[PDB]
Each structure stands twice: as structure tokens, then as C-alpha cells.
């Protein structure tokens, strides 16, 4: 199978986000309401984007740290398909978000930005979490942290634990070959699509490269 | 004396105002809870500071990454303080703190969930002066109580030089557990908002803090 492409809408306002979606909504598989757009506009962003693009998967990247049931329910009532819970959260937070998700036929991903352990990863699997976002912090990226050997190893180990792994964090087109041969579920691109001279062509380039690399 | 922070974990502004119109003048710090940040977005911060410009307004964003952008959105909305979640890369706390400094605001590391003493030393070396020792609401709902290990950890954080806020389902009866520790702030959300008398609930917290400290 080919890795899917997720666009991150890390825009501060809905009209900024629409400037991207009007160009690339049909060029990508998943539309992410980024954490920045969740904070800028609140959960209406989820409701509105799903109303515009009801045939697409809409992910609310809320990076829930606690109050798993309440915050997941807000996102799902706004018609989210998927929500994110941050890796450090108490296990009951992921569990709570998962129970709500099942009411709505949605799903939960654990976002792996920052500091987590393999013991925690086992708890997620035991709790019934099936997706994780292996995620380089943009702030670490800005401080020179590059994709590398240890990432490939960890991504493979997560996959062998039975998770579908999404990869994210300042991904550029030139980074995709690093991941060749690994059954990546989804690649997320925010800035490398939204900020391109032609977002459409940026998205199509990611799709072509993926098709070549995983074909 | 430890200050009293009310958490506005409400889905909509009008729900938050049901609380604030009762207790805004009864507390020291008004928190835009994470639930309100997600429900309404940063407008919540801008609106509540406009209403209560004399009170400290905390945006409980629990930032996980993009420290500079997300803190700047909160501080442009006139937040005084913002939270960063404990698992965030150290450069996220640093980014948020650099922005905070431009606005004469501050950053707290929220300690909900899994973190390490090595990370705590990193926050200190980065110039972080505030943490929120925080029992997860979901852990609370699964039966996790405040205990001596929490008290030991709070004292340890205080000895490292942090001003410590305590939070997580706090009830009036919990206050004596922390006696003798120079707690900076106690947060109460449910035990004030959902009280039969929110005004009595806030006054009782302040009365008890004044007695104990
Ligand atoms: O949650 C996030 C941090 C982003 O949404 C994600 O990393 C994709 O955006 P970018 O490609 O710009 O990093
Ligand atoms: O961030 C939070 C979780 C709450 O805002 C905090 O714990 C205060 O609320 P409560 O007293 O209801 O737990
Ligand atoms: Mg995101
Ligand atoms: Mg809070």
C-alpha cells in the first residue's frame, strides 16, 4: 500500500486555512485541523472544514494532554474523524478518548512529539491504540535536529508492535527516501505544502515521489 | 500567601461567564482552561482579559510544540501566562519563554502525565521559574489520589527553585496536605464552578489558605 498524504492546516484563522484548502483539498487524503488552527479558531474549525469536505478524513490535532473524554467529545461532536492525544498523557486519557471515538466511529492517534518510553508505547497498544504519529518537534528541527538512524529504528519498532505509523515534523520532499522500505501509513506535510509557490504542485510532487518510492 | 486560580474549563464563553460573573473578584488568577481554548480559541483569552484586566489571565494551552507561534498567539491576545506541556521538546519551552519575555509574561510547565527529573533540571537551566504539579483528571477518575509521593515531589520541585502551582481536582479538604510548602498558586475548577455556591466555595478556599499559610 502507498503512504497517504495529510495536509496540516496550521493556520491561525479559517480564511488563511481556506486559502490552502481551495487549492489542495482534492490533492491530499487527510485534512488536518492543526493545533494552531484549533487554538486560533476553536473547534468550529473542525465543523466547518468537515462541512466543506465531508468525503475527506478530517483530523483534529488537539494533542490532548488530559480530559480525554471531554476534549475528544468536543472534536467528535464537531464531526472530526480522528483526534490526537499527546504521548505524555496519563493512560486513562487515551482510554477515555478511545471510548468516545468508538461512539462516533472515529479513532485516536498518540502523537509522539517529545519525551515518551517503550513502556508507555506498550500501554497504548494494550489500551487498543492502533495509530501513532512519529513526530519530530518543529522546535527541535529549528535547533538543527535532523531525521536519522534512531528514527528509522524506532519507526520500525513501532510498526512491529502493531501500530500504523504516521510520520511528521517539517517534512520536505527530500526526506521521503529516508523512509523507503518501511510501511508508513501517512506522511504529514504542513509548511512544505502551504508555503510553496504552488501548493498544488507541492502536493502533487509528494504524491509522485511516494508512488515511486513505495510503488 | 498561595494565590487562588479559577479554571474556566467551559466549552463556550457564555458558560464561562456564568462562573466569572459570580467569582471574578473572589480569585487572583483567571485561567482560560484548555477546554475553553479548544471550544472558543484564543478569543477567550482576549475577551476575558478585556473584562478583567486587573487579574492575571493564564491561557492553559498546554503547548506540545511550536512554542513560539502558539505562545505568541496567546500573548497577542493579552495573556499574562501560558502553559507548555511537560513532554515538549526543550526548545519548545525555550521558544515560548523568549516570546513571553517580549510581552513581560511568563511560561509554566504543566506536569500532567509522564516526565522525568532530568527534564525538570533542563527546564530550570532554560530559565523556567514555574511549574504546575498536576494530577490528571482522568487518573483522578480512575481512582488516583493525592499522596505523600506528590508532596515529596512538590517539595523537590520547590527546592530546585520553581514556584509550584498545585492542581487536579482540588477540594477544600485537600489543602492541609500541602501545609508548610511555599505553594505559589492553588487551581480550583470543578470545586468552585460546580459548587452550590461558587462564591462561598472561593471564599472558603481563601479562608483556608490564610489559616494554613
Ligand atoms: O503538529 C504539527 C507540528 C504539524 O501539524 C506537523 O508537523 C506538520 O506540519 P509541518 O510539516 O509544517 O511540520
Ligand atoms: O487543566 C486542568 C485539568 C484543570 O484546569 C485544572 O486541574 C483545574 O480544574 P479542576 O480543579 O476541575 O481539576
Ligand atoms: Mg499538527
Ligand atoms: Mg487547566
Curated annotation (Swiss-Prot), chain B:
Q: Where is this site: Transition state stabilizer?
A: 62, 65
On whether Lyase is a keyword of this UniProt record, the answer is: yes
Reading the lineage from the top rank, the first entry is Bacteria
UniProt entry tagged with the keyword Transport:
no
Single Gene Ontology MF annotation? 3-dehydro-L-gulonate-6-phosphate decarboxylase activity
Q: State the Gene3D superfamilies in the record.
A: Aldolase class I (3.20.20.70)
Q: What does the record note about the cofactor? A: Binds 1 Mg(2+) ion per subunit.
Specify which residues bind substrate according to the UniProt entry for this protein: 9, 190
- Which cofactors are named for this entry? Mg(2+)
One of its GO biological process terms is: L-ascorbic acid catabolic process
Spell out the family assignment given in the record's similarity comment: Belongs to the HPS/KGPDC family. KGPDC subfamily.
Q: Under what name is this protein listed?
A: 3-keto-L-gulonate-6-phosphate decarboxylase UlaD
- Annotated organism of origin: Escherichia coli (strain K12)
* Lineage of producing organism: Bacteria, Pseudomonadati, Pseudomonadota, Gammaproteobacteria, Enterobacterales
Amino acid at each position: 500500500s502507498l503512504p497517504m498524504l495529510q495536509v496540516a492546516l496550521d493556520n491561525q484563522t479559517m480564511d488563511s486555512a481556506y486559502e490552502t484548502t481551495r487549492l489542495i483539498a482534492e490533492e491530499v487524503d487527510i485534512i488536518e485541523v492543526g493545533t494552531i488552527l484549533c487554538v486560533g479558531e476553536g473547534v468550529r474549525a473542525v465543523r466547518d472544514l468537515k462541512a466543506l469536505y465531508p468525503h475527506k478524513i478530517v483530523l483534529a490535532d488537539a494533542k490532548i494532554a488530559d480530559a480525554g473524554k471531554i476534549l475528544s467529545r468536543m472534536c467528535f461532536e464537531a464531526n472530526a474523524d480522528w483526534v490526537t492525544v499527546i504521548c505524555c498523557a496519563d493512560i486513562n486519557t487515551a482510554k477515555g478518548a478511545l471510548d468516545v471515538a468508538k461512539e462516533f466511529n472515529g479513532d485516536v492517534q498518540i502523537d509522539l512529539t517529545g519525551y515518551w518510553t517503550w513502556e508507555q508505547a506498550q500501554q497504548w497498544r494494550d489500551a487498543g491504540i492502533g495509530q501513532v504519529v512519529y513526530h519530530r518537534s518543529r522546535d527541535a528541527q529549528a535547533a538543527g535536529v535532523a531525521w536519522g538512524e534512531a528514527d528509522i529504528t524506532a519507526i520500525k519498532r513501532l510498526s512491529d508492535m502493531g501500530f500504523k505509523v504516521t510520520v511528521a515534523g517539517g517534512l520536505a520532499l527530500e526526506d521521503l527516501p529516508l523512509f523507503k522500505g518501511i510501511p508508513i501509513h501517512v506522511f504529514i506535510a504542513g509548511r512544505s505544502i502551504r508555503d510553496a509557490a504552488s501548493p498544488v504542485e507541492a502536493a502533487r510532487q509528494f504524491k509522485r515521489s511516494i508512488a515511486e518510492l513505495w510503488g
